[PDB]
Every structure is written in C-alpha cells, then in structure tokens.
Amino acid sequence: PKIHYRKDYKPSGFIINQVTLNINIHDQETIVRSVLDMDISKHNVGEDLVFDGVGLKINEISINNKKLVEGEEYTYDNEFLTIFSKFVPKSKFAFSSEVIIHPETNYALTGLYKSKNIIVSQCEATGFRRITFFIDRPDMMAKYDVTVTADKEKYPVLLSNGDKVNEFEIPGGRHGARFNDPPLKPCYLFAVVAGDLKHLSATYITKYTKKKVELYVFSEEKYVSKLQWALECLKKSMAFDEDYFGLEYDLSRLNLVAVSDFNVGAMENKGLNIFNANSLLASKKNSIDFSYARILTVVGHEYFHQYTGNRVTLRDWFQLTLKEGLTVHRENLFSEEMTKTVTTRLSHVDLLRSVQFLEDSSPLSHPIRPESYVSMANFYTTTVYDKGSEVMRMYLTILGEEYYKKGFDIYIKKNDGNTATCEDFNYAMEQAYKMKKADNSANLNQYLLWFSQSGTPHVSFKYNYDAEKKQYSIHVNQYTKPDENQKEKKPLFIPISVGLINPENGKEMISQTTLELTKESDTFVFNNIAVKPIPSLFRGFSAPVYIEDQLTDEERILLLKYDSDAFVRYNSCTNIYMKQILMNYNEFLKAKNEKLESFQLTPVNAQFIDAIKYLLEDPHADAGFKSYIVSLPQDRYIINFVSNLDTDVLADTKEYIYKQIGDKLNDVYYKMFKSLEAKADDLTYFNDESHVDFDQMNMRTLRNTLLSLLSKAQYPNILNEIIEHSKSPYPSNWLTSLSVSAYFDKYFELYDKTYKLSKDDELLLQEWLKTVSRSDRKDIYEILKKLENEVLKDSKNPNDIRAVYLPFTNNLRRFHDISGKGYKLIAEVITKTDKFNPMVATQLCEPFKLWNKLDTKRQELMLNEMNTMLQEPQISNNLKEYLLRLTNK
Ligand SMILES: [Mg+2]
Ligand SMILES: [Mg+2]
Ligand SMILES: [Mg+2]
Ligand SMILES: [Zn+2]
C-alpha cells in the first residue's frame, strides 16, 4: 500500500518532449500506437525506466525501433512497465509501444471509454496511463501529435486538442483525423472524442488582440437544441475573464462536448472541455431552474482553468487547491456578477458550512494542501475545492480589488507556461500586500498556515461600550480544535469585515473596515461611537470559520431587519434558529431519556416570527433571501453543534419549530404564494432560449418553498393549489407538485403524471428520480424498490444511480431508521457500484461521513455496515482507503 508524501517531491530522471499517438477505434477493441521522444534529465541517477500503464494489453514495445524482449529487458505487472536501466539509452531516444484497450467495457469512466454511442477520454488525474504508457504526473510537459481513426458512419466527428491538420479516408468505411498541439501540456489535459455529434457554433472576438475564436458546443443529435444556454455561458465566461482579469483566450477554437456517462460535472481538457450532460444541456420545457445556474457555473469553471490550471500548471497533485480552489473562487466571482442576486454568495456559504464543516470535523479532515495520499482521486474534496476557494477569496478581502488584481496579474505573468505551487501564489499576493501596506518588510508567511492547517477555526467575541467616552471595543478570540493532523494548532491570519449598526436608526456608523486578526486574541477599539452599536461581523462571510457572535436574539433580529450585509442578516437568522433548535432538541431528548408523561417546550421567539413576517411582506425585499429566512438551517450544519445526535429527536425539534412559525404565518405564506404567481411563472420569454432571469427563478424558489411549508402544515384546501401547480409548464413547479403531494392521497396520481412528462428526456428523468427519492413518504422503502425494478434496473450510469439514492439519504426520519435498513441499503449499493466504478462507489459513501456524530446506536449500525463493506474480498483501492480513513483504522 504505497503512500506518497508532499515533502518527497523530486523531478523525474527522464524527459518526454513529444507524444505521437495513433488511436485506432474498432468494434471490439481500440489499438493505441504511441511514440515518445524522450531524453535523460539532470536528475537521472541511472535508474530503471518506469512507465505507468494500467490494464494495457501489450502487443509490442520498442526503444529506437528495436523490439524489446519480455522478462529479459522489461517486466509489466498491469500497473508499471519497468525497462531495466542497462537497456535504457544515455541520450535522446524514442520509446514506442502498441497496446490494446477496450472502451466498450470501461465502466469506471476513466481512461478511454464509451458513453452511449460516444467514445470519450477522461485523464485527470491518473487516467492517461489507462490509454498508453507514460510517466503519468503533471510536471511531465510534452507536445502532442494525435491521429484518431474510426468507422465513418458510427463516428463522423473526431476531436482532440490543438489544430485539426489533416482529414483522410481509410479503406473499409473508415476515416481519420490528425490533430497537432504544439504548446507543452501535462498528460491529464489530453482528450479525444469520437461520435455522431451535432453542434451549435458562434464566433467570439477577443477584447484586446481582436482574435477571432470559433466556439463549438456538441451533443448527441436528440439533445442538440438544449445547447444554446451553454453557448451563451461560454461567451459570458470569456467576457468576464477579459473584463475582471484582463485575460483573453489564446487558441483559435474552444470545443465543449456533452456526454451521458461522467463521474463528475466537467473537465478542462485544453480546447476540448468535456461535460456531464447534466452540466451542459438545458431547455425551459425539459429542465428544472437549477440547471441554468449549474451550466453557468460549470461552463465558467472549466473556462477559467484555461489560465488557472492549463496555462499555469500544477507541479504535483499536492498543489490541487492551487487550480481547484482558485478556479472555484474565479467561478464564484463570475456567478455573483452574472446572477446579480445575493443568494449566489449565500448558496456558497450554505454549501461550505454544512458539507465542508462536517468534513473538517470528521475523521476525513485534511488541510487544503494535504501532506500525503494513497488514492489521488480521494483529494478531490469539498475542503480542497470550497475551503480552498474561501482561502483564495480571503486574499481579495485583505488586498481589496485593485491590489488583488495586481497580485493576480503578478501570479500569471511570472508563472504562465510553467508548473507552479501554492507558495508561488502566496508570493504573488505578498508582493501586492507589500505595495498595499507601503512597506517591503510586510509578509504573508503566517497566511501559509491556511494551506497546511486542518480544522475549522472558531472565532468568538466580547464587547464593551463606554457611553461617556463614546468608545467601543471588540475583543476577538480564535481557536482551532486539535485533530489527527496537528496536536498544536497555530493562530491564523483572519480578516474580519465589519460594520457597526446604530440600533436607533439602522444606519452605518463606520466606513468599510477589515479587522486583521493575526494573534490568538486581540482587542479592536473604535473612538467617536455616539451610541452603543450592534456589530455586523464577518460581512460577506469574510473567513471560513465558526462565528460565535455572542449577540442577544433582540440584536440578531435588528441585524436581520436593518443590516446592509446579506450574509450577516442570513447569519443572524441562522443563529436565532440554532439557539432555538439546541434548546428544543435538549427538551425533547430529556423527555425521551426520562420517559416523561408530560413536559414543556420553549416556544419560538415571537419578535423573531414578527421580523420574518415584516421581511416577507416587504415588496422591495429579495425573493431568494426570503426563501432562506423561512427555512431552518441544513441538518448537516446542525450536526456540528450537537454531540451524539439523535436523528429522531432532531426531526421532532424541526417539526415543532416549523409548526410554531406556520401557526402564526401560514395565511401570510398563502397570500404570498398566490400574489407571486404572475411574476414567478411569467411565460413571456419561455420560447427565448437565451433569456435567463435569476430573479424570476428565485421567485419560483420562494413559491415552491412556501407551497412545501403549506402542504406539510395541511393548510386548508392546499391540495387544489398542488393539482394546479402540476399543470405548470416549468419542471421546477411540476416536480415540486409531485414532492409536496407526498402528504396527500393524490401522490401516486402525480407520480404517474410527472413520470410521463419526464420519461422522454434522459436528464429530466434523472430529475424525476431525484424528486421521488427525496419525497417525504412513509412507504419510501417500497417506492425505492419500485424505482429499482421499473426505472433504474442494472444501469451503470452515475447520474441514474446517484439520482435514485443520494436524495433519499437526506431523509432524516427514514434514511436513519433505527433498524439500520437505510444504512444496509446504501452499503449494498456502494458494494455493487464498487465492482465497476470505484469513484462513484466512494461518492455514494457520503451519508456515512457523519457516522461518529450520531447517537450511540446509529454510530454502531453505520460502523457495522462500513466494516461489512471493508470485508468485501473484491473491494477497490479507492473504497478501501476511504473507509479505512473514515473508520479511523
Ligand atoms: Mg485492459
Ligand atoms: Mg466585452
Ligand atoms: Mg441512459
Ligand atoms: Zn476544476
């Protein structure tokens, strides 16, 4: 079991200058011929030549056109091809090989594979070695000359990186295409696509150089009409990188291709970005609203990698956050600018605080730059991506827009066309920090701890106000709990964006201020503060931390109503709910523990309910923001605050709180549901493929949120609203009608209606599957059995498997059924999936991440299932490593 260490990085004793590939696609096999023009590096110590090569069938291998003899000159163990040093030349040489691979049976979706009738590659991170032999690591930069041959009728469209230099006919109904890509690239960015693809195209003219760029978006014929939004998103991404960063696309063409079978969202292969169909295709008739924001973010993300990942490369896989964290940060800036809705930033914070905080307090906790790995694929995490994006975003908060843009340009100019590390990025930002602070002694050495220290910091406050002195003090403390990665945690450089609200009039008392907390504790004093303020802390969620505001609910209500910052208002509401949840949770738990015949529950704060009503009734307030305020915090956010969490007691606590609020606001919720109809469901632009209105989609989110609240409350005659909602032309509405009808006798009637509406579109059927999976049904186990038998069957499509099972794992009462039946069900699916797709089997482990945070009985049931999965003789290296780390073994 090999463990790779970050501190062990050493450049290779070899160089690969040129790759010349011939990929011959046939009915039952693909033949791959490859010539590597190689050299000996200055780091060479006369070692054996070792190539990565996984599952390759060797026809022949040669050095300088001399065939090598198996056993005497080379060994191959289905993982590593070792050429004994005595047979390796001492100067420039050619290594050649001919191997056979089988894309048709490649269900792992890594290397070269078949997705429906499209042949497609996936090389990141270690997939290139599944195509041909290589020193499969990102610092091995080479030029690529690639020829693809295939049956013309089955595969008329052939694509790879670089310029298409030749197209030729081959006897027997075959054809070929040659692509030459002269700029150096790592092998993970190589890609090839063959299929009967249809396209939409456009020309984009760059801002400064005025270069004409050809943009092509591809899919199978049936779904070509769903590519228009992706094309608009690509134009928007190009414009944003030019406008904000002054960055222009350098190539003559950019291809985007949608495939049905994909492990993740998309992949940034140079000039040939490949996408999960669910992250590229959409139509107003056949997609839910979420598809629009998803395509915008994913198209944006892969486009932004052209600089942060493609032009500026990674030295090694330990630097992953350098491309992933930075690109998620670029994607988030872009989406905030494109949507112009406060909910975009809130959605990012909601994701981090629920999912990433759970990971950071779990046995899987790691820094954004880990010190070791066994399985590289298990490094692609919410910590590396999302905490990494927040670490990248803190540089912008610290420096401000002007100096951040200066530091970013320094990073690009210094590292363009080269490999880079997290230190190179920090160095560039430090140069901008020195410029901003107007002193060359200033540094960001302490900032590096954000890359090496795991765990979420806790930031707590105490306040003081002297009315006579007009002097206000904010005492701040930071603390990170020790974990398995560091016995001793050090204080971080934490930027605290702050405001001071006058409680008398809700006005700002001070200008924009970012407190730079660099010690374990500090006291920040403010003079000429005329009245005791209410502090607005961590505006825009300025640091990825647990905020302990120490404010009363009266102060939190005033911020919720009057503060200027969307995050602080949202957070103040979150904190009020958390204080209520913890109180009622303890009250129900004590009643259950003591077997009480009667007991009391603390009611929901009446002034808090009044504030929710005030905000909901405000016609000038944001519909997206309103949907957050009426929703309780996520279960995965709540679990970070409760030890030995009893899921039944939490379900009872949530039910009580929602009923308490609904008993006062249902008539308001109903009135709003009806009044929002006209604007939310406006059909004016339904047949305009490019007209996307994020505010209108948020108005639909609010209506669908209110309808769910009203249906759960059994609001008088709400079933009439539900049935009418099922007739809407918008899938977000008609699929909502299915989910909310779970509380009524008409559920199966809507189940059949919505299935009929969804069945003829691959992606919409996956959305219908998700809706069914998350339906709050008492007969959910019987329903999942019906989906398996009638719809899912033996599908190996990751979108199908994930749609049926993952939404169900969010069902608090049912997935966590005390018998352990839900844990048993998901473990059976993990083990079955692991046989063909280890990466998807590991994704399916997601509900087990919080195992040691639940009540002792559920901890025991989850652990038993993970130990059963670990005992499987055929377990993959990926799943084994993941479960060993998760179970602290
Ligand atoms: Mg094979
Ligand atoms: Mg422009
Ligand atoms: Mg299918
Ligand atoms: Zn990425």
The ligand with the least distance to the CA atom of 304 is 4
The residues near 801 (Cβ < 8 Å, ≥ 6 apart) are 792, 795, 829, 833, 840, 844
Contact 149, 23 (CB under 8 A): yes
Q: Which distant-in-sequence residues (6+ apart) come within 8 Å of 716 by Cβ? A: none
Q: Using CB atoms within 10 A of its CB, is residue 187 exposed (0-12), middle (13-18) or buried (19+)?
A: buried
* 305 annotated as a binding-site residue: yes
Residue 284 Cα to ligand 3 midpoint, Å, equals 21
Q: How far is the CA of 267 from the centre of ligand 4 (A)?
A: 7
Domains 284-454 and 455-550 share a fold: no
Supply 356's token pair: 């990433």
266 among the known binding-site residues? yes
Ligand in closest contact with the CA of 57:
1
- Cβ atoms of 729 and 680 closer than 8 Å: no
Sort strands 212-220 and 197-205 into parallel, antiparallel or unpaired.
antiparallel
Measured distance CA(331)–CA(311) in Å, rounded:
17
The residue extents of the domains of the chain are: 11-197, 198-283, 284-454, 455-550, 551-889
Q: List phi, psi (to 5°) of 560.
A: -60, -40
- Nearest ligand for residue 384 CA: 4
Q: 736 φ, ψ to 5°? A: -60, -45
Interacting residues of 377 by C-beta distance below 8 A, sequence separation 6+: 125, 126, 838, 839, 842, 878
Ligand 3 centroid distance, CA of 797 (Å): 7
Q: How far is the CA of 813 from the centre of ligand 4 (A)?
A: 35
CA of 843 to the centre of ligand 3 (A): 20
Tell me which method was used to determine the 3D structure: X-ray
- Helix H, strand E, coil C: the string for 101-161 is ECHHHCCCCCEEEEECCEEEEECCCCCHHHCCCECCCCCCCEEEEEEEEEECCCCCEEEEC
199 annotated to a ligand binding site:
no
Question: Among residues 111, 96, 98, 83, which one has the least CA distance to residue 13?
Answer: 83
d(CA 884, CA 863): 11
Contact between 392 and 369 (Cβ < 8 Å) = no
Q: Give backbone dihedrals phi and psi of 477, rounded to 5 degrees, phi first.
A: -130, 145
Question: What's the rounded Cα separation, in Å, for the pair 217 and 735?
Answer: 28
Sequence-ordered strand ranges (E) for 152-191: 157-160, 163-170, 174-185
Pairing relationship of beta strands 458-466 and 546-548 according to DSSP bridges: parallel
- Is cis: bond before 202, omega within 30 of 0? no
Its sign, for the CA torsion 697, 699, 701, 707, is negative
Q: Are 710 and 676 in contact (CB under 8 A)?
A: no
Place of tokens 């949608």: 258
Q: 265-298 as b/e, with b when 16 or more CB fall inside 10 Å?
A: bbbbbbbbbbbbbbbbbbbbebbbbebbbbbbbb
Distance CA 524, CA 276 (A): 49
Give the distance (Å) from ligand 1 centre to CA of residue 101: 5
Token pair for 233: 């998103």
Q: What is the spatial distance between Cα 35 and Cα 739, in angstroms, rounded to a whole number?
A: 56
The residue length of the chain stands at 889
Ligand nearest to the CA of 237: 2
Is 268 known as a binding-site position? yes
Phi-psi region of 793 (alpha: psi -120 to 50; beta: other; left: phi over 0): left
Q: How many degrees, rounded to 5, is the angle at CA 520 between CA 517 and CA 524?
A: 45
Cα 146 from Cα 161, distance rounded (Å) = 8
- After which residues is the backbone of the chain broken at C–N > 2.5 Å? none
CA of 222 to the centre of ligand 3 (A): 13
Please name which of 273, 175, 283 lies closest in space to residue 222, comparing C-alpha atoms: 283
DSSP one-letter string for 384-450: IIIIHHHHHHHHHHHHHHHHHHHHHHHHHHHHTTSEE-HHHHHHHHHHHHHHHHT-TT---TGGGHH
Q: How far apart are CA 30 and CA 151, in angstroms?
A: 12
Contact yes or no for 43/10 (Cβ under 8 A):
yes
Contact residues for 300 (Cβ-Cβ < 8 A; gap 6+): 233, 236, 237, 240, 330, 331, 334, 335
Listed residue (389, 408, 852, 392) closest to 640, CA to CA: 852
Give the whole-angstrom CA distance, residue 822 versus residue 188: 38
Angle of helix 821-834 relative to helix 856-870, nearest 10 degrees, comes to 20
Query: What superfamily does domain 11-197 belong to in CATH?
Result: tricorn interacting facor f3 domain (2.60.40.1730)
Instruction: Consult the annotation and say whether 691 binds a ligand.
Output: no
Distance of CA 375 to the CA centre of its chain: 19
Report whether 609 contacts 664 (CB < 8 A): yes
- Give the separation between CA 78 and CA 99, rounded to whole angstroms: 12
The percent of the chain in helix, strand and coil, each rounded to the nearest 5, is: 45, 20, 35
Do 499 and 565 meet the contact criterion of CB atoms below 8 Å apart? yes
Angle between helix 228-245 and 388-415 (nearest 10): 70
The C-alpha atoms of residue 183 and residue 233 are separated, in whole angstroms, by 26
How far is it, in rounded angstroms, from Cα 311 to Cα 327?
13
Q: In this structure, which ligand is nearest to the CA of 206? A: 2
Round to whole Å and give the CA distance between 238 and 248.
7
Among candidates 863, 867, 865, which has minimal Cα distance to 855?
863
Consecutive H or E run containing 535: strand 534-537
**Rounded CA separation 235/243 (Å):** 12
Q: At what angle do helices 343-351 and 566-593 cross, to 10 degrees?
A: 40
d(CA 677, CA 160): 48
Task: Report yes or no: 735 and 768 within 8 Å, Cβ to Cβ.
Answer: yes
Query: For the purposes of burial, counting CB atoms within 10 Å of the CB of 888, is it exposed (0-12), middle (13-18) or buried (19 or more)?
Result: exposed
Cα(390)–Cα(383) distance, integer angstroms: 10
On whether the CB atoms of residues 492 and 453 are closer than 8 A, the answer is yes
Pairing label, strands 174-185, 111-115: unpaired
CB of 304 closer than 8 Å to CB of 327: yes
Pick the CATH number of 198-283 from 3.50.50.60, 3.40.720.10, 3.30.2010.30, 3.30.300.30: 3.30.2010.30
List CB contacts of 426: < 8 A, sequence separation 6 or more: 444, 447, 448, 451
Query: Which residues are marked as active site?
Result: 302
Rounded to the nearest angstrom, the distance between the alpha carbon of 33 and the centre of ligand 1 is 15
Q: What is the CATH T-level fold of the domain 284-454, as seen in this structure?
A: Neutral Protease; domain 2 (1.10.390)
**Three-state secondary structure call for residue 482:** coil
**Strands in 453-520 per DSSP E:** 458-466, 471-479, 494-501, 513-517
Assigned superfamily of 455-550: Aminopeptidase N, middle-beta domain (2.60.40.1840)
Q: How far apart are CA 223 and CA 219, in angstroms?
A: 6
Q: Is 186 left (phi over 0), alpha (psi -120 to 50) or beta?
A: beta
Give how far Cα 142 sits from Cα of 20, 263, 401, Å: 10, 26, 36
Cβ contacts of 649 within 8 Å, gap of 6 or more: 585, 588, 589, 592
DSSP 3-state of 333: helix
587 is annotated as contributing to ligand binding: no
Top CATH class of 551-889 equals: mainly alpha
Determine the Cα–Cα distance for residues 847 and 635; give it in Å rounded to an integer. Answer: 12
Task: Specify whether the CB–CB gap between 14 and 89 falls below 8 A.
Answer: no
Q: What end-to-end distance do the CA atoms of the chain give, in Å?
A: 14
* Residue 809 φ/ψ, nearest 5 degrees: -65, -15
Rounded Cα distance between 591 and 571, Å, is: 30
